[PDB]
Design a protein around this ligand. Sequence first.
Ligand code: AMP
Ligand code: AMP
Lengths: 178, 173
Amino acid sequence: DSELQLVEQRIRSFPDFPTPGVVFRDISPVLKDPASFRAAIGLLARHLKATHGGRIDYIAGLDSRGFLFGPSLAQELGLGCVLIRKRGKLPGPTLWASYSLEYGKAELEIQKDALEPGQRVVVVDDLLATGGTMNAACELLGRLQAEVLECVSLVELTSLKGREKLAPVPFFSLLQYE
Amino acid sequence: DSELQLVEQRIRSFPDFPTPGVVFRDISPVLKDPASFRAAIGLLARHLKATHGGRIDYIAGLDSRGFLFGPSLAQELGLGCVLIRKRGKLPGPTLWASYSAELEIQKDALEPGQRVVVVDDLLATGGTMNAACELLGRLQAEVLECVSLVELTSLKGREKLAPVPFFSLLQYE
Ligand SMILES: Nc1ncnc2c1ncn2[C@@H]1O[C@H](COP(=O)(O)O)[C@@H](O)[C@H]1O
Ligand SMILES: Nc1ncnc2c1ncn2[C@@H]1O[C@H](COP(=O)(O)O)[C@@H](O)[C@H]1O
């Protein structure tokens, strides 16, 4: 797939960041090359349309790098984009969920009126690692009685078994690295 | 203008958030309504093309709410988007700038002389946009303009960025 190649060629890998042994996957060059960004959004949108048809109501973008892809993906599908944020950033009534991040805890948050019961959503972030962040997003959405059809990312680190963590919610990534 | 109205109708205000005194302007509904989002991006893109012609090389999006608009604005203009992030998030060699918190940019994000337009959701004191402009200036990039959806005029952020031009879709005190 030439389109997938346009994305893969623009992932930059940095060893030992932020800690020794970790390989950081930097999607910045995908954003910087308009053809690469367009290819990434197009591949995600084709997959989602082919898989879910007209069932998707909204895209949910995850703070902060998911924000880079959510609105463009939503626009390509003709849908709105709702936001899941780090706790403390959103006004009005919210729900929040705690999860493990590195050595400590972090918290995600969503406005109670972001979705109504029965609405169907697809969550997007740039990269799936342990799956902790995506799992918390799924939990929050479930508490609004929204149905999470799928989670998607550009990159998946398969050795961390994020896919299994999200089951039985389906997951799809453009690219995979150990 | 019906397009500008599509955006204005989707800004929600919250008094006394996050602390007493502050009136929070929430752009979330703009993102949730695909028509409103398209209108916002279109209005910004039309302004930038009419003002700069073909001179813009890149859009720079500011962490984190500027990330919601940067890539779509860049795409509409046929340009790439570079990222300015909260410090500690980017790999490789970086530069950073404080302001009353720290922003950061990769040393290789831009080449000297490249022309950039910075975007964020809202301009208030201008501290955040000013730090972004400083970082870009240290890469020897030329900042053509800064833009946002919302500007709080009583806080005089526009004066803070001068002489760099600024444009907002909507203004509140
Ligand atoms: N190796 C990596 N390279 C870049 N980002 C990563 C990496 N590992 C985790 N992340 C980020 O951390 C969050 C996901 O981590 P996790 O909750 O473990 O799936 C997302 O915001 C990812 O962007
Ligand atoms: N009243 C406000 N409502 C929503 N966001 C705000 C408000 N004031 C400041 N901000 C955010 O803070 C940054 C602008 O602050 P400043 O650096 O004072 O211009 C931007 O990232 C805005 O998203």
